[PDB]
Amino acid sequence: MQAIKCVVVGDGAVGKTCLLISYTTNAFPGEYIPTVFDNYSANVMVDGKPVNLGLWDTAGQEDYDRLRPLSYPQTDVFLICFSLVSPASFENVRAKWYPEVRHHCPNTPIILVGTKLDLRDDKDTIEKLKEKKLTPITYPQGLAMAKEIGAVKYLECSALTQRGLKTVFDEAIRAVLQNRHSMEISPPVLISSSNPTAAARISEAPSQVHISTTGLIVTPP
Ligand SMILES: Nc1nc2c(ncn2[C@@H]2O[C@H](COP(=O)(O)OP(=O)(O)NP(=O)(O)O)[C@@H](O)[C@H]2O)c(=O)[nH]1
Ligand SMILES: [Mg+2]
């Protein structure tokens, strides 16, 4: 089975973990728990042929800067995420995440993902940004940032509503499997995860992330 490794990076609180849990299990977690590393191993069918996705979640906090690149070797595609309602997270795409990824991985494709699409029209969110002379990030603004960092695609989504969500992962797959026509991609079947919320939905005992000689590995429950 062809395997694809995808690593998700971006500022704290932009919605990386919810993106992964929502896509892989159609659930949306109930308490914000900061990530260290987590793995999701999910299968899809691309034009009727199985492909394994190895999805890696990372910590957005700067305290994990030294450790985070442990996840990077052998990555096939990065998702750099920012919240559509956090201008700071948007600027950090350029200031922090693009350089960090590119310095480690000069040739790996990047998809730029704007998250929390469901908040872009939220009155309270808009007003709070306006108090600070700011606005939610617009689609053209995200597109421009994607061009500045040489991302292969710019995509917007909500983990909460799932608008745009399948497309993020399908386009990540398409960006990797450049020889495939990839006309149709099935929803994912989660096989294993180290995230307790996601692992519980395979049932409905998480795997464990460990350091190994070869980088990060997963040990079964
Ligand atoms: N409305 C809305 N809230 C979202 C969405 N995605 C995430 N959130 C919320 O945003 C907060 C952070 O989400 P989370 O996925 O934990 O973010 P993270 O990027 O993994 N943070 P870290 O680097 O610290 O692990 C949570 O309160 C979560 O419910 C979304 O699509 N819409
Ligand atoms: Mg997280």
Side-chain angles (χ1 to χ4, degrees), residues 1-30 32-130 132-203 205-221:
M1 179 173 335
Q2 174 108 59
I4 295 176
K5 178 176 175 181
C6 172
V7 176
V8 185
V9 304
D11 281 6
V14 297
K16 298 182 299 298
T17 296
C18 286
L19 179 85
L20 291 161
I21 296 170
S22 182
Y23 171 64
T24 61
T25 73
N26 300 315
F28 187 88
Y32 167 37
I33 297 158
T35 304
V36 179
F37 296 103
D38 275 301
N39 176 252
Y40 302 69
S41 182
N43 293 337
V44 294
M45 302 296 255
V46 179
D47 294 335
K49 299 300 195 191
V51 175
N52 177 259
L53 309 180
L55 310 174
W56 295 81
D57 204 354
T58 68
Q61 294 59 44
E62 65 178 25
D63 285 355
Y64 287 94
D65 282 353
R66 199 69 168 99
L67 291 166
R68 189 180 309 99
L70 285 170
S71 66
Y72 293 172
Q74 286 44 82
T75 299
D76 296 304
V77 56
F78 286 92
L79 305 185
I80 295 178
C81 299
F82 73 93
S83 166
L84 289 165
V85 297
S86 173
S89 76
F90 176 70
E91 296 221 314
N92 280 331
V93 169
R94 179 168 57 218
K96 180 168 185 166
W97 300 108
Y98 160 62
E100 177 170 299
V101 166
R102 264 289 167 259
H103 289 315
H104 291 273
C105 297
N107 305 306
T108 303
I110 295 170
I111 295 183
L112 184 60
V113 181
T115 62
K116 311 191 186 173
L117 174 63
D118 60 286
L119 295 178
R120 182 146 66 188
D121 299 305
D122 179 67
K123 178 64 179 187
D124 274 39
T125 299
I126 291 171
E127 284 310 317
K128 282 167 202 183
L129 286 168
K130 185 178 109 139
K132 301 180 298 170
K133 309 307 189 305
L134 293 165
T135 56
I137 302 310
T138 72
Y139 178 94
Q141 279 179 284
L143 182 61
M145 180 61 83
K147 289 186 179 291
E148 288 197 26
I149 69 165
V152 301
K153 288 293 176 184
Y154 172 59
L155 299 164
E156 298 181 332
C157 72
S158 174
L160 180 62
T161 68
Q162 304 191 322
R163 283 183 170 160
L165 181 64
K166 188 171 182 291
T167 295
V168 166
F169 291 92
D170 287 357
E171 293 302 318
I173 294 160
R174 290 183 173 99
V176 176
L177 301 180
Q178 289 187 60
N179 299 114
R180 296 209 196 186
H181 290 83
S182 304
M183 299 301 284
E184 184 164 52
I185 301 176
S186 71
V189 177
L190 190 62
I191 306 306
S192 67
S193 181
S194 61
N195 175 276
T197 295
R201 292 202 50 107
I202 309 166
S203 315
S207 66
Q208 301 179 358
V209 178
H210 287 285
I211 192 64
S212 75
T213 56
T214 61
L216 300 178
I217 62 168
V218 173
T219 65

